[PDB]
Design an enzyme around this catalytic site. Structure first.
Site, mmCIF file in Angstrom:
data_model
loop_
_atom_site.group_PDB
_atom_site.id
_atom_site.type_symbol
_atom_site.label_atom_id
_atom_site.label_comp_id
_atom_site.label_asym_id
_atom_site.label_seq_id
_atom_site.Cartn_x
_atom_site.Cartn_y
_atom_site.Cartn_z
ATOM 1 N N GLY A 27 0.826 -1.198 0.000
ATOM 2 C CA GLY A 27 0.000 0.000 0.000
ATOM 3 C C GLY A 27 0.859 1.245 0.000
ATOM 4 O O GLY A 27 2.080 1.191 0.185
ATOM 5 N N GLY A 29 -0.070 5.372 1.178
ATOM 6 C CA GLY A 29 -0.872 6.532 1.504
ATOM 7 C C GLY A 29 -0.152 7.824 1.175
ATOM 8 O O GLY A 29 0.776 7.864 0.363
ATOM 9 N N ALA A 30 -0.590 8.901 1.828
ATOM 10 C CA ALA A 30 0.030 10.204 1.625
ATOM 11 C C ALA A 30 1.292 10.398 2.459
ATOM 12 O O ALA A 30 2.049 11.337 2.190
ATOM 13 C CB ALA A 30 -0.970 11.320 1.941
ATOM 14 N N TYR A 31 1.539 9.538 3.450
ATOM 15 C CA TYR A 31 2.687 9.675 4.337
ATOM 16 C C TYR A 31 3.846 8.751 3.980
ATOM 17 O O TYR A 31 4.937 8.915 4.543
ATOM 18 C CB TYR A 31 2.267 9.418 5.792
ATOM 19 N N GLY A 32 3.645 7.805 3.073
ATOM 20 C CA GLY A 32 4.706 6.906 2.662
ATOM 21 C C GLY A 32 4.156 5.710 1.912
ATOM 22 O O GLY A 32 2.955 5.599 1.658
ATOM 23 N N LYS A 49 7.908 0.581 6.104
ATOM 24 C CA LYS A 49 7.339 1.830 5.600
ATOM 25 C C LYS A 49 8.448 2.832 5.303
ATOM 26 O O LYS A 49 9.228 3.185 6.195
ATOM 27 C CB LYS A 49 6.346 2.433 6.598
ATOM 28 C CG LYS A 49 5.807 3.793 6.146
ATOM 29 C CD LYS A 49 4.593 4.217 6.962
ATOM 30 C CE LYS A 49 4.996 4.630 8.368
ATOM 31 N NZ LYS A 49 3.829 5.021 9.232
ATOM 32 N N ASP A 164 -1.888 2.925 14.435
ATOM 33 C CA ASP A 164 -2.177 4.165 13.700
ATOM 34 C C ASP A 164 -2.626 5.298 14.628
ATOM 35 O O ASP A 164 -3.730 5.836 14.516
ATOM 36 C CB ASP A 164 -3.220 3.928 12.600
ATOM 37 C CG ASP A 164 -2.630 3.276 11.344
ATOM 38 O OD1 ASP A 164 -1.416 2.965 11.316
ATOM 39 O OD2 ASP A 164 -3.401 3.041 10.385
HETATM 40 MG MG LIG Z 1 -5.431 3.192 9.794
#
Ligand SMILES: [Mg+2]
Ligand SMILES: O=C1C=NC(=O)N1c1ccc(Cl)cc1
Ligand SMILES: [Cl-]
Ligand SMILES: [Cl-]
Ligand SMILES: [Cl-]
Ligand SMILES: [Cl-]
Ligand SMILES: [Cl-]
Length: 347
Positions: A27, A29-32, A49, A164
């Site tokens: 996956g 996301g916007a953070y890594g 990550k 998270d």
């Molecule tokens: Mg989450």
């Protein structure tokens, strides 16, 4: 220093120690971006990550430091921990990339309750573990802020970990018919007052209700529709709570609504264990000052089968003074570098 090797996976360069093998994208996301991997040193399957643009601004540099400090501190059976952190850089001068390593998580609580309710013994055990983790987190004066089923990992033996942490979500992410808002306490959903650790107990109440019924408790189509669902269940506020709402405009809106009494929770949660009903009534309290705490909830009779006060530990003290500190990008970057090179792995 370990030997690193490079590779390109889905248009991203990954430079990692030789111990990590069989990298597979999972996956981004916007953070890594995230890869699954096999760790030959420990024998664990892990998530790796790579942070994206960790030092692009003061806000982003401070957020990178905040995330690393928090993950290095968390050492509890019901909370995600840090297995490793590394950079390919050989000096602060060339430091640019940060990689974080954790245990690979399988299913989350969604993939267990999706359109389905659970037995009471399972609800007892799952909510007990959330509260055991939260007692630990709150004892370090940390607020999670984003507890919801997709942030809870569960395995085949019903064992649970919190992940998270809220690192401070956009306006658009909280707009409309969205699960990102359904578990939030009313006082922070509308910015009535300052966040505090009681907001996490409201989220636990929303999760516990959903495990018992198989359905979202407050699935609002927007902020105001959700507030109306909440007040129908728990009642409109008395002047005691109205006093504590710093927003004059928010006080004015609440008083525009016709008053409503608190509902009978045994007529809402039909067929539930009466001890589960009693605990929900103590978590889902509008006035946050009066909600049950995690430490108090662990001693409630609903958990008699699992509660053990000699096996519910608290956290080491956690220094958050950096949060009120004003620094330049390169100073936040230097502090982060120090925390990478000082990491000591778990036994
Ligand atoms: Mg989450
Ligand atoms: O609370 C509980 C415990 N067992 C259930 O079947 N419920 C439940 C209550 C209301 C509705 Cl509408 C759906 C499920
Ligand atoms: Cl290695
Ligand atoms: Cl862990
Ligand atoms: Cl680097
Ligand atoms: Cl969720
Ligand atoms: Cl500390």
């Amino acid at each position: 220093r370990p030997t690193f090797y490079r590779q390109e996976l889905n248009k991203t360069i990954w430079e990692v120690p030789e111990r990590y093998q069989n990298l597979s994208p999972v996956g981004s996301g916007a953070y890594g971006s995230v890869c699954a991997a096999f760790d030959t040193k420990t024998g664990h399957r892990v998530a790796v990550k790579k942070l994206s643009r960790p030092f692009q601004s003061i806000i982003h540099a401070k957020r990178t430091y905040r995330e690393l400090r928090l993950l290095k501190h968390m050492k509890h059976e019901n909370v995600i921990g840090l297995l490793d952190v590394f950079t390919p850089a050989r000096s602060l001068e060339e430091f640019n990339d940060v990689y974080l390593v954790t245990h690979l998580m399988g299913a989350d609580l969604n993939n267990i309750v999706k359109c389905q309710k659970l037995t009471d013994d399972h609800v007892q055990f799952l909510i007990y573990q959330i509260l055991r983790g939260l007692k630990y987190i709150h004892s370090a004066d940390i607020i999670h802020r984003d507890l919801k089923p997709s942030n809870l990992a569960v395995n085949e033996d019903c064992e649970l970990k919190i992940l998270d942490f809220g690192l401070a979500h956009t306006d658009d992410e909280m707009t409309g018919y969205v699960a990102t808002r359904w578990y939030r306490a009313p006082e922070i959903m509308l910015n009535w007052m300052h966040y505090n650790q009681t907001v996490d107990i409201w989220s636990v109440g929303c999760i516990m209700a959903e495990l018992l019924t198989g359905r979202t408790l407050f699935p609002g189509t927007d902020h105001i529709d959700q507030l109306k669902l909440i007040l129908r269940l728990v009642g409109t506020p008395g002047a005691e709570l109205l006093k504590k709402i710093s927003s004059e405009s928010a006080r004015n809106y609440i008083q525009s609504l016709a008053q409503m009494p608190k509902m009978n929770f045994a007529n809402v949660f039909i067929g539930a264990n009466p001890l589960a009903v009693d605990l929900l009534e103590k978590m889902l309290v509008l006035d946050s000052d009066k909600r049950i705490t995690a430490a108090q909830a662990l001693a409630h009779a609903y958990f008699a089968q699992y509660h053990d006060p000699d096996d519910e530990p608290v956290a080491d003290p956690y220094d958050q003074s950096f949060e009120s500190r004003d620094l330049l990008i390169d100073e936040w970057k230097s502090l982060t570098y120090d925390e990478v090179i000082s990491f000591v792995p778990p036994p």
